[PDB]
Amino acid sequence: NFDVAYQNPDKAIKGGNLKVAYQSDSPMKAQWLSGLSNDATFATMSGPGGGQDGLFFTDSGFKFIKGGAADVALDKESKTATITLRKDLKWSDGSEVTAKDYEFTYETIANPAYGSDRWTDSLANIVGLSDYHTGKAKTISGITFPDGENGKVIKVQFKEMKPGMTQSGNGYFLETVAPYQYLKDVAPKDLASSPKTTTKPLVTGPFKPENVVAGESIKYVPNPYYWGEKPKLNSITYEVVSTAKSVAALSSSKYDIINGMVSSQYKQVKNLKGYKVLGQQAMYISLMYYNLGHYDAKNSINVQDRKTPLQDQNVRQAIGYARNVAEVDNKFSNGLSTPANSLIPPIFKQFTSSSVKGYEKQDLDKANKLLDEDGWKLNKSTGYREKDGKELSLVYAARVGDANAETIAQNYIQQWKKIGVKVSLYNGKLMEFNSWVDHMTTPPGANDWDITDGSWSLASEPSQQDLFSAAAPYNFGHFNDSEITKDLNDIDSAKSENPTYRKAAFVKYQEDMNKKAYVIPTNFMLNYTPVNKRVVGMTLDYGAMNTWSEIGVSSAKLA
């Protein structure tokens, strides 16, 4: 019941100023360089500016297409990625974006003198990148310029190809440029605090930031040198707004668009006149974990050696079958949570299918039967199942604070009683989030919990490697399955270069995970954006690459 786009009946005027806010209770931290930026709020806010100078367009599935600021070509044989910047891709000062600018991005992340948090071990796969990163090498041998530094072409040499490389957000190579000629004489220790990367940057986008007020706002004006379609709007103002003030701002028609509004507010925004509420499915999964083991950090491996009745597959399935997720979503979520059939949400068109079945539908009868056939026999006197004299009783580490978190956890606990399973909260209450993070992340892992809830935001390349592999630290339940490992290797294989083969691999892995049920998919999520009725051309379609240029207003006066 959500629309991706607002189809405005009235046509756009020429010009106009658009007013956008981002809901945050903490201040904007303005850093125009991608490597130096650690604030999510600013990063969304940077969008009219080019999103910290992102090079590549994608399709709706997040697969790279050729029409953006640059294009990227992969040759498997030479183990190379070729980046070609547009002939007239330029910085906001009219200066040419060059091959060197793309290379400089690597230096900002890779060279420790800059202080970036964004190095990944994935970058080690690029030839010579580690040696540069460790200071062994002055340069990055893996990166070359066929037409030189002032040229438009960059070659990137990898040790190994990965199939995810056709997806944006792969991590194997970087997608941004840094204005080298501009920042060249800034000492690296200074770059992050420099005016040149904060209040007075150079950008590649359809708009450039005319004024930046620290912690609060940006004023955007058209970038004359933008390669692309010239924007309709004269300007856009983008401001931080508090959670507390957001509903009122919409009520008073202060903003055309507010971004980042939380789910609990939605009913308040739902009927407001003068606005249309847009919804889009998030790159998000929420899921249920079983505690099956521990993590061996020295050897970097999960060992599934925990003593639990959760070791039984029937037991894992039954507990999943028992939950009323769809029903819980219907009562409390307001339609922002929709039951997950799989670990990957359907917006990843090429990595999943509706055909996959999980635990989206409650089956109390199936759950009871599974337990019966596995020797877990109900004691009439108590209401709970036993095997070999031992009660089937578990500890549930539920956590704060999705909306209605106490209510939801209790609901599940009751469904479990229906199946003869005794479930209690960890220490009698909800875990606070920071505490939960420590409890899950800190090796070797705790033995005092059986069931927990977790969630992830999935990248444009929705890699399972950091989440569910044998070698992963964040594999919270510590499962280790040969079939699952085989499935994960297959996804990342040379065969997976073929998209049809890769889709089937992703699909197989999702099915095997559901059947094994080491973890159970809980929810998909929707994000909503209120849009003032004056707005022309607004859409949340993931396929749309030119919304900032496209975007318009029917009139000066907000609806």
Side-chain angles (χ1 to χ4, degrees):
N1 282 339
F2 280 98
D3 285 308
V4 168
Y6 166 37
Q7 244 168 259
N8 189 324
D10 315 340
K11 72 176 194 285
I13 67 156
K14 297 184 48 95
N17 177 72
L18 198 76
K19 291 188 273 177
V20 190
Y22 192 81
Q23 176 166 102
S24 190
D25 290 308
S26 61
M28 175 181 92
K29 182 172 82 222
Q31 176 55 239
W32 301 89
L33 310 184
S34 198
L36 281 32
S37 204
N38 312 309
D39 178 44
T41 284
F42 175 76
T44 308
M45 286 169 87
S46 78
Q52 292 147 323
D53 310 311
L55 296 161
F56 309 113
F57 285 3
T58 63
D59 67 17
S60 61
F62 308 117
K63 173 173 162 101
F64 293 127
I65 58 186
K66 307 290 187 155
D71 80 76
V72 58
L74 301 167
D75 179 22
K76 172 182 60 216
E77 233 89 300
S78 53
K79 287 177 165 176
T80 291
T82 307
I83 297 64
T84 307
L85 310 162
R86 274 181 186 273
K87 293 179 179 179
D88 45 6
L89 175 64
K90 273 135 160 90
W91 296 108
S92 44
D93 73 339
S95 83
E96 203 74 84
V97 186
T98 55
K100 169 79 195 167
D101 297 324
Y102 179 66
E103 183 275 350
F104 193 50
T105 283
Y106 287 87
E107 300 195 6
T108 72
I109 298 161
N111 187 339
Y114 311 97
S116 166
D117 278 1
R118 302 193 164 267
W119 169 270
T120 63
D121 275 335
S122 286
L123 303 173
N125 189 60
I126 292 170
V127 172
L129 199 39
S130 292
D131 287 348
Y132 177 80
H133 175 65
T134 61
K136 258 147 217 211
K138 291 315 187 250
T139 75
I140 302 168
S141 55
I143 288 166
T144 58
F145 323 111
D147 307 302
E149 295 194 14
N150 68 327
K152 294 288 180 165
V153 183
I154 309 92
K155 285 291 190 54
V156 181
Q157 180 87 44
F158 306 102
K159 294 160 205 271
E160 305 290 328
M161 297 307 266
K162 307 271 153 88
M165 288 177 171
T166 49
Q167 291 289 118
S168 181
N170 65 74
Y172 293 111
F173 60 93
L174 305 176
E175 305 168 35
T176 69
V177 282
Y180 178 64
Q181 286 306 315
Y182 200 49
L183 313 173
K184 194 173 38 171
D185 298 306
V186 178
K189 67 176 81 194
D190 288 327
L191 194 51
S193 60
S194 169
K196 290 188 182 243
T197 67
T198 53
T199 50
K200 285 126 171 108
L202 301 192
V203 306
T204 68
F207 290 87
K208 63 173 166 164
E210 193 269 335
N211 194 48
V212 173
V213 179
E216 284 173 12
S217 74
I218 315 164
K219 205 226 184 150
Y220 280 114
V221 302
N223 172 17
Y225 307 104
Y226 180 64
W227 57 270
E229 202 186 346
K230 159 180 305 161
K232 312 206 184 219
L233 296 161
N234 301 329
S235 72
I236 307 171
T237 49
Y238 213 148
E239 321 174 34
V240 181
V241 62
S242 79
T243 297
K245 279 152 137 162
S246 291
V247 168
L250 292 169
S251 178
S252 76
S253 288
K254 189 172 181 196
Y255 297 110
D256 299 293
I257 295 147
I258 308 164
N259 284 324
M261 293 191 67
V262 303
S263 153
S264 84
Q265 313 201 283
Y266 166 78
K267 64 179 180 180
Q268 285 145 246
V269 178
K270 183 178 179 180
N271 299 121
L272 291 187
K273 298 192 307 170
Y275 285 89
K276 166 105 198 262
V277 173
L278 296 185
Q280 178 59 290
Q281 193 179 69
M283 299 181 215
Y284 168 101
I285 185 63
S286 97
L287 70 142
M288 185 180 273
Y289 282 97
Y290 294 131
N291 198 1
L292 301 172
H294 87 270
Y295 185 72
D296 178 341
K298 189 224 186 79
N299 304 311
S300 288
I301 200 89
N302 286 279
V303 193
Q304 210 186 317
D305 65 0
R306 176 168 193 264
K307 282 156 60 177
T308 173
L310 285 177
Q311 288 296 355
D312 304 333
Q313 178 170 131
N314 280 36
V315 181
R316 311 196 289 280
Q317 296 177 339
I319 282 160
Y321 281 121
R323 286 198 301 170
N324 56 343
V325 176
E327 181 185 349
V328 157
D329 290 337
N330 293 321
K331 288 147 141 170
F332 313 90
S333 64
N334 285 294
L336 299 164
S337 298
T338 63
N341 64 307
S342 67
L343 297 163
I344 313 215
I347 52 164
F348 293 94
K349 292 151 115 88
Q350 253 48 260
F351 317 102
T352 191
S353 189
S354 269
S355 87
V356 180
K357 310 288 144 158
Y359 308 83
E360 59 280 11
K361 176 205 181 256
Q362 190 180 43
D363 205 344
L364 298 154
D365 290 350
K366 191 178 200 200
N368 278 308
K369 183 178 179 180
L370 281 157
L371 288 167
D372 271 320
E373 292 178 359
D374 187 48
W376 285 103
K377 293 179 179 179
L378 201 59
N379 187 281
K380 299 296 183 181
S381 155
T382 66
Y384 300 106
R385 302 164 176 282
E386 302 177 354
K387 184 204 226 98
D388 306 321
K390 314 323 192 275
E391 194 171 70
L392 186 45
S393 161
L394 298 163
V395 172
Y396 178 21
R399 89 203 157 153
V400 190
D402 282 334
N404 305 113
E406 285 272 6
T407 299
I408 299 163
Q410 200 58 56
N411 211 282
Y412 293 143
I413 274 160
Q414 305 303 121
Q415 312 312 308
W416 292 322
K417 204 210 247 217
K418 289 184 200 164
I419 70 166
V421 186
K422 205 185 263 178
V423 182
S424 295
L425 297 166
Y426 178 88
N427 207 27
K429 69 188 185 61
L430 296 184
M431 292 186 74
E432 294 291 343
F433 180 83
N434 293 336
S435 178
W436 175 93
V437 173
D438 288 338
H439 215 69
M440 311 306 146
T441 69
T442 305
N447 195 38
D448 63 355
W449 73 267
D450 306 296
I451 311 163
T452 196
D453 302 313
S455 60
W456 298 103
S457 151
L458 294 174
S460 281
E461 160 66 359
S463 164
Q464 309 293 106
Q465 269 302 122
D466 284 349
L467 311 176
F468 309 113
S469 82
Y474 292 162
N475 170 358
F476 290 148
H478 318 277
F479 80 87
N480 193 320
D481 186 297
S482 284
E483 177 170 41
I484 293 304
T485 286
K486 200 136 176 276
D487 288 345
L488 301 170
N489 295 336
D490 205 39
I491 282 169
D492 287 335
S493 80
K495 272 136 114 226
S496 262
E497 271 153 24
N498 183 296
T500 298
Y501 183 100
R502 189 136 128 125
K503 176 177 199 199
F506 270 96
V507 169
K508 190 187 189 286
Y509 152 83
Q510 281 153 103
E511 299 196 304
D512 287 350
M513 289 278 282
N514 281 353
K515 161 195 58 162
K516 285 156 187 313
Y518 306 122
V519 304
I520 314 274
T522 312
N523 285 316
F524 303 143
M525 195 170 75
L526 281 164
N527 285 322
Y528 74 99
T529 296
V531 186
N532 196 254
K533 290 193 202 193
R534 92 173 177 135
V535 185
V536 186
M538 190 47 182
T539 182
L540 301 170
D541 166 24
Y542 281 120
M545 293 299 317
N546 282 124
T547 301
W548 295 119
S549 305
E550 231 64 54
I551 205 159
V553 304
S554 68
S555 93
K557 179 71 183 114
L558 273 75

